[PDB]
Protein: Endoglucanase
Organism: Eisenia fetida
Amino acid sequence: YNYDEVLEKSILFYEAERSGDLPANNRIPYRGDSALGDQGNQGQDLTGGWYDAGDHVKFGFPMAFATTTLAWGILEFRDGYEAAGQYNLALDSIRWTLNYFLKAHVSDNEFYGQVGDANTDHAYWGRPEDMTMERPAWSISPSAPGSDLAAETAAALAAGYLVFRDSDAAFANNLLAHSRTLYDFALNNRGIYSQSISNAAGFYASSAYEDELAWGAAWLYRATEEQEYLDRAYEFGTTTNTAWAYDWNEKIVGYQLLLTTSAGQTDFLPRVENFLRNWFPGGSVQYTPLGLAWLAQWGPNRYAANAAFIALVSAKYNILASESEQFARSQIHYMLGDAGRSYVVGFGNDPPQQPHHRSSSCPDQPAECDWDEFNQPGPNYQILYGALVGGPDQNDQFEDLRSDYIRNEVANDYNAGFQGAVAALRAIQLRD
Ligand SMILES: [Ca+2]
Ligand SMILES: [Mg+2]
Ligand code: NA
């Protein structure tokens, strides 16, 4: 497989998800300015960010986690991005959301975590450029805590500091300053963000915030090397529990691996190895007949690509390296087409033609776009290059229907581990 092309197109997927005032060098011809009125309750500019999935909600929690995971991959697999000619583009990709998080952090202890009412937004089918419904904005604050959202955003900002400090120190230092402030806010104003922003509970409900507190502390320790953050990571982290998955809700194996590798903390390595072995063949995750590690019906490709990412970071630091690389490659290659068709839109053999995605479902301007474009039986008019779809059922079956909001879903977090894993595989081609 051409990993250079996969990385190029994955980054184009994120570019097709951009909200706001698009740059002059916009590479997605069917996308234009949209949601230029997104703003806080005192008129604070909230334009930008990524639309989460095939909708037009800006969901802060997965948006931040996708950014942390993308930044981690850029840090560890820079050589793969560079060999692919995609490193500057990858930095530009996450600069978009990092700038959004800076806007959303309107004061020390207030952070906007959602723009768009998901119920109103999902009732609409059409271009984001054509939206006319009200787009409410909700924040977390001392009266409305969200330790999970605040600490995940602090993690993304600290990871972003590390990514950018060697090319744009003014930007990087601003990210780190806000990381510190948001993490203090997360620690000192405790609660679940999707209880405080109740519109989020139907879509990205957080089950617990302690793992985010450990994760944000681990990233801030990598960024600052200040002992107080390593202490926070041990305080809220576990050495005794193994993660079920790595995803936008569960940070456990993420911070365990980060602390093992970047911080040299041996106490967490047994749980990293438990996670890896659970996902490897012979472990505790069922494999489809054709070889996809299949955790659940909701975004199996996302779960498997996330585990592949964790495995490839592990391999880089000589943690079960040979088995990790072989497992990770098997999962990414399933998604690139090993089972007979690609699960990456616009890539490879017989890629999915009907991603559950509004803007790519619309014909070129000035044609009409409404629920007719949801229902129509043919391919989406625009090719959503790079999007990893949710994936097949447990028997490798996939109908490629836009109405299949489970299997044909696309999302920011679906591509986040995937993209870093592809960059890791490209880097291994350099090593070998
Ligand atoms: Ca959590
Ligand atoms: Mg077109
Ligand atoms: Na403009």
